[PDB]
């Protein structure tokens, strides 16, 4: 038992480790998407930049969770980071939709974590989640939804012109 | 077949994918070490900072390999990132020794890759490896060896005072 | 025999002269393309600027090869610079494709030169080629492939709007 | 027929294409001279610099003629650029004399072009030639004559000391 | 055996020690030449400055080789530095010619070292040699050849005026 | 006989040449010590820096003696620079003690030189020695004695911690 541990439940520790793995997996997926868009037969540099930035932010979130785990006296237990489902994301619109799905999954996991923390009467963990993850996920989901809506209205994925102009004007 | 592909062998493509996975694994290991040293019962902030920086550099090396793969017309195929062997690295000296072992393994993989590229007559890949990875690995191995030697002479791992002073003076 | 000549094979000298002629020819071709796009019935000023810049860079590469030839004690022997195959390049997409073909030809010639230098045990010439030409050619080929992919996706050469928007947004 | 073409005779268009080829040939000759003086057994860096600058200026003149051809609605038709007559220019004095001869040839071609433009009643072409080429050629011929006179008085080509001091003091 | 040693052959270690001795010897020779030209009956301050600078650069190269030897886990074994062949270098032209001969000898030794490293499959050592020594030797040999050519053309060693003017204008 | 020579004895000339050789030998020894401390199994960067600086200062003293020899009309006669006695200096304390011994030897040689100059009635040489070498040697010997005393009191060579802390605090 850690000397700093106080009001930190074992269930909360396990949930934090699971969330760490999920954030690392999201970072891996975003990296895969970015370098799909760096391909010579896709060539959407601003899509690639956007997804690389998302990957870096995801890794930062994982590091913040690890820092919280060390702060509360828990012990980090790392697991394998599974590879992304696809190697070819087939379009900017499809990548945006998959990113929206992934962010909604991450948000649902965070909501389950907050529910568990509320059940265990861990106000510090609850406020940590609320302050650092919930609103960030809400804004990320809203932004991805806006991007998907705009791409659909311009006519993606059939319109390479639509994807090109979105890359230049919205992501540039 | 990619429109930009020229003098790029399938064996080289597969070896580059393997090296990408190895660099990502090294990044994961360094992250594990850093947050082991962030623990309340270890509390070596400069060890943690050093290993976090190593993890970021490993990320950058993996991303550079992915960029090279896209440049040469190859296709990136990501695999699972295996978890690190240990959760508890037991000391600064032990972590330094394991990092030295890992860097020597990475250097050996890079040397095998250079040998394969020389066999396949890929001077661009050979020069890429020589310019961006071989000397960096040599300096990293030399630095880790220096750190291990200094820790042993000061009397680690038995001397918490030795580890504390090394953290303050060499890593600070 | 030059007083500075050392480990410089006659085959290498002849290959360097051939490469000088090839670089000058590439410069001529790029100049032709640029002033095709300066025509009143084409009027793509950013295409013209891009190809003029490529012509200048090709000239610089030829001058660097001549400097290397003088450095190693060889003697420069200039030949006729053949005219470009076409006077009318018919579209931005067609010009981009022909430029990609030309850069791949130049890269293949450079790879043959590196193979000859390796056979003749000329590490200085090998490293000169690797440092100054191979990665530049790889990046140029990747960039041209990206441009061709983007033009095709926007719908060139049928879409004058696609060529106009590419000229403004990617080349501007 | 171009939509911008007005008072531009076919004879003038052909003469402009011929002048473009002549300017490119002069650039090639000056490049040859510069890298002759870059040789280890000649080693006159300021002669080499002077002739390289002349080559760049000749290329600029050719590009200006191509721009004029596009402005007047003519069509550029590029020809082979013949190699220079000599590979070895034998001295600074001999190179200066050959450059003077070449500039006089270029000036005579420009005067014939101006005569043709006057015959065809093309005041725009006449004024273009007068503004951009005739006085530049006159000044270049005067400068080359001054250089030749000075080299002869100092005692070139017999006096390597004369050529060295001219390189340092006049061309430096 | 050093803890950092990897893919470093004993033959390569011995060759590196030999090259260290050769670079130190070259530094000694250049120092001798510089202070020959500092003599009251020679009095060529810019020749002395040039050769002193060459001596400093030679020692820097020796130190870089020693650093490489420590980096790769080899052990430096220093030998006697033999005295230069002559105490009186008899002229600026003769000193320049002897320096050219010495640089060609050093370049040949470096080429033999690169051949040995290629045979032992040591890409790091090969790239180290290519990056830090081969092109420097090529430029140094070219510069010395240019100096010798210029001195001969001005009429050295018979012309003390030629040596004086070369000292002032080329080396000043 | 030199035109500038005045009141300069042949014995003084020979003694100056001997002192030049001694200073060069001291520079060589200090270089050996510095790169011993650059080894991966020693790893004392500040010891290495200190001894490299001492080697450079020894270079400068040798060059100043050569300058004096040229000033007084003497002729420099260079000899072989013998290798240092040891390749392994075994500790910071042992290296400091050997450096103290070497500086005392150099000081004794300088005192013998001053005695000879006084005997030959060479006040310029006497004052040159007094101004540029005697007080520097006294200060260097005092500094080395202080370093040896401090290392012994901290407990070197048994205490790698003592050597590490001395490297950080006194030499850093
Ligand atoms: Na994937
Ligand atoms: Na979802
Ligand atoms: Na782990
Ligand atoms: Na290893
Ligand atoms: Na190994
Ligand atoms: Na053409
Ligand atoms: Na091609
Ligand atoms: Na090819
Ligand atoms: Na590129
Ligand atoms: Na020629
Ligand atoms: Na003429
Ligand atoms: Na005439
Ligand atoms: Na000598
Ligand atoms: Na030689
Ligand atoms: Na030694
Ligand atoms: Na002594
Ligand atoms: Na004594
Ligand atoms: Zn749980
Ligand atoms: Zn690609
Ligand atoms: Zn983009
Ligand atoms: Zn990040
Ligand atoms: Zn977050
Ligand atoms: Zn913390
Ligand atoms: Zn746990
Ligand atoms: Zn998986
Ligand atoms: Zn994949
Ligand atoms: Zn709250
Ligand atoms: Zn637009
Ligand atoms: Zn393979
Ligand atoms: Zn903790
Ligand atoms: Zn700390
Ligand atoms: Zn990173
Ligand atoms: Zn790229
Ligand atoms: Zn693949
Ligand atoms: Zn695993
Ligand atoms: Zn773990
Ligand atoms: Zn790297
Ligand atoms: Zn050939
Ligand atoms: Zn036009
Ligand atoms: Zn434009
Ligand atoms: Zn150019
Ligand atoms: Zn190039
Ligand atoms: Zn050069
Ligand atoms: Zn030739
Ligand atoms: Zn032709
Ligand atoms: Zn044409
Ligand atoms: Zn290389
Ligand atoms: Zn005509
Ligand atoms: Zn040459
Ligand atoms: Zn010059
Ligand atoms: Zn130009
Ligand atoms: Zn002009
Ligand atoms: Zn125009
Ligand atoms: Zn025409
Ligand atoms: Zn011809
Ligand atoms: Zn020629
Ligand atoms: Zn050997
Ligand atoms: Zn003198
Ligand atoms: Zn001088
Ligand atoms: Zn130096
Ligand atoms: Zn060097
Ligand atoms: Zn080092
Ligand atoms: Zn050894
Ligand atoms: Zn000797
Ligand atoms: Zn001597
Ligand atoms: Zn004596
Ligand atoms: Zn070592
Ligand atoms: Zn240190
Ligand atoms: Zn010095
Ligand atoms: Zn000194
Ligand atoms: Zn001194
Ligand atoms: Zn003096
Ligand atoms: Zn003497
Ligand atoms: Zn000896
Ligand atoms: Zn030794
Ligand atoms: Zn006094």
PDB file of C-alpha atoms in Angstrom, chain F residues 21-148:
ATOM      1  CA  UNK F  21      60.177  19.160 -27.272  1.00  0.00           C
ATOM      2  CA  UNK F  22      59.299  18.930 -23.569  1.00  0.00           C
ATOM      3  CA  UNK F  23      56.246  21.184 -23.955  1.00  0.00           C
ATOM      4  CA  UNK F  24      55.032  19.161 -26.946  1.00  0.00           C
ATOM      5  CA  UNK F  25      55.468  15.958 -24.926  1.00  0.00           C
ATOM      6  CA  UNK F  26      53.449  17.444 -22.057  1.00  0.00           C
ATOM      7  CA  UNK F  27      50.683  18.351 -24.514  1.00  0.00           C
ATOM      8  CA  UNK F  28      50.669  14.752 -25.763  1.00  0.00           C
ATOM      9  CA  UNK F  29      50.460  13.394 -22.202  1.00  0.00           C
ATOM     10  CA  UNK F  30      47.545  15.678 -21.324  1.00  0.00           C
ATOM     11  CA  UNK F  31      45.718  14.613 -24.498  1.00  0.00           C
ATOM     12  CA  UNK F  32      46.195  10.969 -23.501  1.00  0.00           C
ATOM     13  CA  UNK F  33      44.779  11.669 -20.033  1.00  0.00           C
ATOM     14  CA  UNK F  34      41.766  13.559 -21.402  1.00  0.00           C
ATOM     15  CA  UNK F  35      40.768  10.755 -23.724  1.00  0.00           C
ATOM     16  CA  UNK F  36      41.337   8.172 -20.997  1.00  0.00           C
ATOM     17  CA  UNK F  37      38.688  10.023 -19.011  1.00  0.00           C
ATOM     18  CA  UNK F  38      36.452  10.115 -22.097  1.00  0.00           C
ATOM     19  CA  UNK F  39      36.259   6.283 -21.989  1.00  0.00           C
ATOM     20  CA  UNK F  40      32.892   4.613 -21.407  1.00  0.00           C
ATOM     21  CA  UNK F  41      34.197   2.704 -18.360  1.00  0.00           C
ATOM     22  CA  UNK F  42      35.576   5.892 -16.751  1.00  0.00           C
ATOM     23  CA  UNK F  43      33.144   8.601 -17.914  1.00  0.00           C
ATOM     24  CA  UNK F  44      34.428  11.750 -16.184  1.00  0.00           C
ATOM     25  CA  UNK F  45      33.623  14.491 -18.687  1.00  0.00           C
ATOM     26  CA  UNK F  46      34.978  17.356 -16.582  1.00  0.00           C
ATOM     27  CA  UNK F  47      38.280  15.561 -15.948  1.00  0.00           C
ATOM     28  CA  UNK F  48      38.496  15.040 -19.711  1.00  0.00           C
ATOM     29  CA  UNK F  49      37.736  18.723 -20.359  1.00  0.00           C
ATOM     30  CA  UNK F  50      40.331  19.875 -17.813  1.00  0.00           C
ATOM     31  CA  UNK F  51      43.083  17.724 -19.304  1.00  0.00           C
ATOM     32  CA  UNK F  52      42.164  18.696 -22.885  1.00  0.00           C
ATOM     33  CA  UNK F  53      42.472  22.354 -21.867  1.00  0.00           C
ATOM     34  CA  UNK F  54      45.871  21.612 -20.313  1.00  0.00           C
ATOM     35  CA  UNK F  55      46.943  19.971 -23.586  1.00  0.00           C
ATOM     36  CA  UNK F  56      45.916  23.064 -25.563  1.00  0.00           C
ATOM     37  CA  UNK F  57      47.816  25.341 -23.166  1.00  0.00           C
ATOM     38  CA  UNK F  58      50.909  23.147 -23.559  1.00  0.00           C
ATOM     39  CA  UNK F  59      50.540  23.534 -27.335  1.00  0.00           C
ATOM     40  CA  UNK F  60      50.472  27.305 -26.897  1.00  0.00           C
ATOM     41  CA  UNK F  61      53.590  27.307 -24.719  1.00  0.00           C
ATOM     42  CA  UNK F  62      55.484  25.248 -27.301  1.00  0.00           C
ATOM     43  CA  UNK F  63      54.395  27.648 -30.050  1.00  0.00           C
ATOM     44  CA  UNK F  64      55.504  30.635 -27.959  1.00  0.00           C
ATOM     45  CA  UNK F  65      58.938  29.050 -27.508  1.00  0.00           C
ATOM     46  CA  UNK F  66      59.174  28.479 -31.266  1.00  0.00           C
ATOM     47  CA  UNK F  67      58.232  32.129 -31.812  1.00  0.00           C
ATOM     48  CA  UNK F  68      60.966  33.214 -29.386  1.00  0.00           C
ATOM     49  CA  UNK F  69      63.492  31.015 -31.205  1.00  0.00           C
ATOM     50  CA  UNK F  70      62.603  32.683 -34.506  1.00  0.00           C
ATOM     51  CA  UNK F  71      62.713  36.127 -32.856  1.00  0.00           C
ATOM     52  CA  UNK F  72      66.263  35.663 -31.554  1.00  0.00           C
ATOM     53  CA  UNK F  73      67.625  34.332 -34.855  1.00  0.00           C
ATOM     54  CA  UNK F  74      67.906  30.738 -33.688  1.00  0.00           C
ATOM     55  CA  UNK F  75      66.850  27.759 -35.773  1.00  0.00           C
ATOM     56  CA  UNK F  76      64.132  25.361 -34.631  1.00  0.00           C
ATOM     57  CA  UNK F  77      65.086  21.677 -34.782  1.00  0.00           C
ATOM     58  CA  UNK F  78      62.124  19.417 -34.052  1.00  0.00           C
ATOM     59  CA  UNK F  79      62.506  15.939 -32.569  1.00  0.00           C
ATOM     60  CA  UNK F  80      60.273  12.912 -32.128  1.00  0.00           C
ATOM     61  CA  UNK F  81      57.479  13.374 -29.598  1.00  0.00           C
ATOM     62  CA  UNK F  82      57.657  10.290 -27.379  1.00  0.00           C
ATOM     63  CA  UNK F  83      54.442   8.541 -26.413  1.00  0.00           C
ATOM     64  CA  UNK F  84      53.142   8.910 -22.845  1.00  0.00           C
ATOM     65  CA  UNK F  85      54.325   6.368 -20.301  1.00  0.00           C
ATOM     66  CA  UNK F  86      50.877   4.856 -19.701  1.00  0.00           C
ATOM     67  CA  UNK F  87      47.705   4.297 -21.692  1.00  0.00           C
ATOM     68  CA  UNK F  88      45.612   3.702 -18.544  1.00  0.00           C
ATOM     69  CA  UNK F  89      45.831   6.408 -15.872  1.00  0.00           C
ATOM     70  CA  UNK F  90      43.743   4.276 -13.470  1.00  0.00           C
ATOM     71  CA  UNK F  91      41.921   7.115 -11.652  1.00  0.00           C
ATOM     72  CA  UNK F  92      41.356  10.834 -11.414  1.00  0.00           C
ATOM     73  CA  UNK F  93      43.660  10.960  -8.388  1.00  0.00           C
ATOM     74  CA  UNK F  94      46.436   9.082 -10.191  1.00  0.00           C
ATOM     75  CA  UNK F  95      46.088  11.296 -13.266  1.00  0.00           C
ATOM     76  CA  UNK F  96      46.250  14.401 -11.066  1.00  0.00           C
ATOM     77  CA  UNK F  97      49.379  13.094  -9.323  1.00  0.00           C
ATOM     78  CA  UNK F  98      51.079  12.260 -12.632  1.00  0.00           C
ATOM     79  CA  UNK F  99      50.177  15.711 -13.965  1.00  0.00           C
ATOM     80  CA  UNK F 100      51.702  17.287 -10.850  1.00  0.00           C
ATOM     81  CA  UNK F 101      54.871  15.243 -11.389  1.00  0.00           C
ATOM     82  CA  UNK F 102      55.003  16.288 -15.057  1.00  0.00           C
ATOM     83  CA  UNK F 103      54.536  19.979 -14.227  1.00  0.00           C
ATOM     84  CA  UNK F 104      57.290  19.784 -11.611  1.00  0.00           C
ATOM     85  CA  UNK F 105      59.586  18.220 -14.228  1.00  0.00           C
ATOM     86  CA  UNK F 106      58.732  20.996 -16.705  1.00  0.00           C
ATOM     87  CA  UNK F 107      59.333  23.633 -14.021  1.00  0.00           C
ATOM     88  CA  UNK F 108      62.732  22.116 -13.207  1.00  0.00           C
ATOM     89  CA  UNK F 109      63.667  22.187 -16.897  1.00  0.00           C
ATOM     90  CA  UNK F 110      62.591  25.840 -17.087  1.00  0.00           C
ATOM     91  CA  UNK F 111      64.671  26.666 -14.003  1.00  0.00           C
ATOM     92  CA  UNK F 112      67.712  25.008 -15.591  1.00  0.00           C
ATOM     93  CA  UNK F 113      67.062  27.043 -18.748  1.00  0.00           C
ATOM     94  CA  UNK F 114      66.887  30.261 -16.713  1.00  0.00           C
ATOM     95  CA  UNK F 115      70.145  29.340 -14.968  1.00  0.00           C
ATOM     96  CA  UNK F 116      71.838  28.791 -18.333  1.00  0.00           C
ATOM     97  CA  UNK F 117      70.485  32.100 -19.664  1.00  0.00           C
ATOM     98  CA  UNK F 118      71.758  33.914 -16.565  1.00  0.00           C
ATOM     99  CA  UNK F 119      75.168  32.286 -17.051  1.00  0.00           C
ATOM    100  CA  UNK F 120      75.263  33.372 -20.711  1.00  0.00           C
ATOM    101  CA  UNK F 121      74.193  36.943 -19.775  1.00  0.00           C
ATOM    102  CA  UNK F 122      70.963  36.820 -21.808  1.00  0.00           C
ATOM    103  CA  UNK F 123      68.626  39.172 -19.912  1.00  0.00           C
ATOM    104  CA  UNK F 124      66.017  39.084 -22.690  1.00  0.00           C
ATOM    105  CA  UNK F 125      65.763  35.291 -22.484  1.00  0.00           C
ATOM    106  CA  UNK F 126      65.758  35.427 -18.674  1.00  0.00           C
ATOM    107  CA  UNK F 127      62.902  37.945 -18.633  1.00  0.00           C
ATOM    108  CA  UNK F 128      61.003  35.995 -21.302  1.00  0.00           C
ATOM    109  CA  UNK F 129      61.154  32.874 -19.127  1.00  0.00           C
ATOM    110  CA  UNK F 130      60.206  34.799 -15.978  1.00  0.00           C
ATOM    111  CA  UNK F 131      57.306  36.613 -17.650  1.00  0.00           C
ATOM    112  CA  UNK F 132      55.727  33.734 -19.554  1.00  0.00           C
ATOM    113  CA  UNK F 133      56.559  30.429 -17.890  1.00  0.00           C
ATOM    114  CA  UNK F 134      57.744  30.488 -14.266  1.00  0.00           C
ATOM    115  CA  UNK F 135      54.673  32.001 -12.608  1.00  0.00           C
ATOM    116  CA  UNK F 136      52.327  29.968 -14.806  1.00  0.00           C
ATOM    117  CA  UNK F 137      54.135  26.796 -13.732  1.00  0.00           C
ATOM    118  CA  UNK F 138      53.961  27.855 -10.078  1.00  0.00           C
ATOM    119  CA  UNK F 139      50.209  28.463 -10.315  1.00  0.00           C
ATOM    120  CA  UNK F 140      49.655  25.196 -12.205  1.00  0.00           C
ATOM    121  CA  UNK F 141      51.602  23.218  -9.594  1.00  0.00           C
ATOM    122  CA  UNK F 142      49.645  24.896  -6.787  1.00  0.00           C
ATOM    123  CA  UNK F 143      46.332  24.105  -8.503  1.00  0.00           C
ATOM    124  CA  UNK F 144      47.277  20.462  -9.082  1.00  0.00           C
ATOM    125  CA  UNK F 145      48.401  20.134  -5.467  1.00  0.00           C
ATOM    126  CA  UNK F 146      45.076  21.565  -4.311  1.00  0.00           C
ATOM    127  CA  UNK F 147      43.194  19.088  -6.513  1.00  0.00           C
ATOM    128  CA  UNK F 148      45.244  16.138  -5.229  1.00  0.00           C
TER     129      UNK F 148
END
